[PDB]
Design an enzyme around this catalytic site. Sequence first.
Site, PDB file in Angstrom:
ATOM      1  N   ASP A  76       3.250  -2.386   5.393  1.00  0.00           N
ATOM      2  CA  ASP A  76       3.574  -2.872   4.216  1.00  0.00           C
ATOM      3  C   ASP A  76       5.150  -2.668   3.897  1.00  0.00           C
ATOM      4  OD1 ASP A  76       2.746  -5.550   3.235  1.00  0.00           O
ATOM      5  OD2 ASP A  76       1.596  -4.382   1.498  1.00  0.00           O
TER       6      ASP A  76
ATOM      7  N   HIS B 229      -0.906  -4.316  -1.521  1.00  0.00           N
ATOM      8  CA  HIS B 229      -0.251  -3.177  -1.294  1.00  0.00           C
ATOM      9  C   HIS B 229      -0.951  -2.000  -1.230  1.00  0.00           C
ATOM     10  CE1 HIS B 229       3.850  -2.056  -0.351  1.00  0.00           C
ATOM     11  NE2 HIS B 229       4.122  -1.552  -1.349  1.00  0.00           N
TER      12      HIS B 229
ATOM     13  N   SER C 238       5.539   1.045   2.666  1.00  0.00           N
ATOM     14  CA  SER C 238       6.305   0.401   1.729  1.00  0.00           C
ATOM     15  C   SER C 238       7.748   0.973   1.747  1.00  0.00           C
ATOM     16  CB  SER C 238       5.599   0.911   0.268  1.00  0.00           C
ATOM     17  OG  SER C 238       6.241  -0.169  -0.558  1.00  0.00           O
TER      18      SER C 238
HETATM   19  C1  7BW Z   1       7.483  -1.876  -3.456  1.00  0.00           C
HETATM   20  C2  7BW Z   1       7.373  -0.574  -4.270  1.00  0.00           C
HETATM   21  C3  7BW Z   1       8.173  -0.490  -5.382  1.00  0.00           C
HETATM   22  C4  7BW Z   1       8.089   0.567  -3.254  1.00  0.00           C
HETATM   23  C5  7BW Z   1       7.061   1.298  -2.715  1.00  0.00           C
HETATM   24  O1  7BW Z   1       7.257   2.270  -1.829  1.00  0.00           O
HETATM   25  N1  7BW Z   1       5.691   1.050  -3.215  1.00  0.00           N
HETATM   26  C6  7BW Z   1       4.567   1.654  -2.741  1.00  0.00           C
HETATM   27  C7  7BW Z   1       4.118   2.570  -3.839  1.00  0.00           C
HETATM   28  O2  7BW Z   1       2.817   3.190  -3.368  1.00  0.00           O
HETATM   29  C8  7BW Z   1       2.285   4.249  -4.342  1.00  0.00           C
HETATM   30  C9  7BW Z   1       2.983   4.881  -5.415  1.00  0.00           C
HETATM   31  C10 7BW Z   1       2.184   5.711  -6.160  1.00  0.00           C
HETATM   32  C11 7BW Z   1       0.834   6.213  -5.545  1.00  0.00           C
HETATM   33  F1  7BW Z   1       0.136   7.226  -6.218  1.00  0.00           F
HETATM   34  C12 7BW Z   1       0.246   5.517  -4.640  1.00  0.00           C
HETATM   35  C13 7BW Z   1      -1.033   5.985  -4.168  1.00  0.00           C
HETATM   36  N2  7BW Z   1      -1.952   6.432  -3.765  1.00  0.00           N
HETATM   37  C14 7BW Z   1       1.060   4.531  -3.854  1.00  0.00           C
HETATM   38  C15 7BW Z   1       6.073  -0.084  -4.353  1.00  0.00           C
HETATM   39 CL    CL Z   2      -0.147  -6.519  -3.855  1.00  0.00          CL
END
Ligand code: 7BW
Ligand code: CL
EC number: 3.1.1.47
Length: 371
Positions: free
Chosen positions: A242, A297, A219
Site C-alpha cells: 500500500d 490501509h 505506506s
Molecule cells: C498515508 C500515511 C499518512 C503515510 C503512512 O506511512 N501511513 C501509514 C501509517 O501506518 C501506521 C502508523 C502508525 C501505526 F502505529 C501503525 C501501526 N500498527 C501504522 C499513512
Molecule cells: Cl484505508
Amino acid sequence: KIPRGNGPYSVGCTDLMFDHTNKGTFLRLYYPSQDNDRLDTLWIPNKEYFWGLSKFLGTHWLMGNILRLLFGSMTTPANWNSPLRPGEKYPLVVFSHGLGAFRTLYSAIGIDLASHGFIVAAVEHRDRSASATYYFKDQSAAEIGDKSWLYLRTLKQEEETHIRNEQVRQRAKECSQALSLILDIDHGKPVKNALDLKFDMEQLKDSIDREKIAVIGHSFGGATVIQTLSEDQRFRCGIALDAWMFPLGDEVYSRIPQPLFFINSEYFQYPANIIKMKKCYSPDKERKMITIRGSVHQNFADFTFATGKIIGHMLKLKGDIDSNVAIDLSNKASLAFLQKHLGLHKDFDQWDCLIEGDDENLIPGTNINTT
Ligand SMILES: CC1(C)CC(=O)N(CCOc2ccc(F)c(C#N)c2)C1
Ligand SMILES: [Cl-]
Ligand SMILES: [Cl-]
C-alpha cells in the site's frame, strides 16, 4: 493476538543498534530460531513510543499514558533473544515502516517471513517520520543507557513536498546502511550492540545468503522500497505494501530496474497515487499489482490485530475482510514473488497464482479507475 508465522521454522527476535548515534542503524531482527522455549517479545517496548503515538494521533500526551495502560504489556509471538537456527544461509529482507509507526509494529509480517526461513531487519528511521525513536548522544550515554528520544515532526502544508522527499531519501540511506551492517556482521566483523542484550551477533556470521536481498515496506515504507531500489542495486527486488507515493521525486520513476510488486488495500488507494505507481512501469521491467478485497490501509500493520472486531472496524484498523485472512494473502503472495526474483529453492511457488490476483479475496491489478 498477532498471529504466529505459518512457516516450518520457529522464530526469534532481538534488537540491534550500531553505532549508538542518531546516524547509526537501529533495527529489530526476526530470524529462524534454534529454540522455541523463550519468553515472547514485548510488542511496544518503551513508554515513549506511546507518547509518540499520541502526537501522531494529534492528542494530548496523557492519551499516550492511556495507550500504554491498554497495550504496554502486549507481546508478539517471537522468542526473545533465542539462538539463531544454525546450519543454513538465510535470505534477507530489509523492512521499512510507515509514517507515525516504528520498527516493532510489523511483526505479523516479520515473524511470518522468518518462519519461512528469512532474516528480517525492520529498520527504525531517524528522519522524524517515526512516532518516536531513540539513540545515545555519545559513548558515555550509551554505556549508562541514557536514551535521547526523537519524536514525530509535524509539517506545515508548505513543507510537505520538500520535507517528505528529504525523508524518503534519508529512509533509503538508512535501508542501505542497515544492509551493509548486516552484510558486515555476516562476514564476522565485531560489532558491539549499543543495546546490552543477550544475543551474540557472532551467530549471524556466515548465516546470510548474500545475493538474496529484498526490501519491503508499508505506506511511507512503500515509497522507501522504491527510492531504495533506485539507489542500491544490492537490493534484488522490492515489495511495496500500500505504497504512499507522494514522497518520491520525479526523477526516480524511470530508475528502478529491479522487479517490483505493489500489494494494495481496496480502500486506501486513489487516482493520484495509482498514476504514480503506473509511472514505475516500462516494457523491460517486471511489475505486478494486486488489491486485497475488503481491506484498509491498516491491514498491513500490527494494530489490525490489537483490538476486537467492532472497535477495530470503527477505528479503521480492520476492514470487511478478516485481518488474518488479509495478512495471509499479502505474506503468501510476497513469498511467491521473492522466490521468483531471488531464485529461492523453497515451495513458495505454490502461491504463484496470488501474484496474478487469482483468489476470491484478490482483485488483479487495481479497483481504481484513472481516466
Ligand atoms: C498515508 C500515511 C499518512 C503515510 C503512512 O506511512 N501511513 C501509514 C501509517 O501506518 C501506521 C502508523 C502508525 C501505526 F502505529 C501503525 C501501526 N500498527 C501504522 C499513512
Ligand atoms: Cl484505508
Ligand atoms: Cl486522487
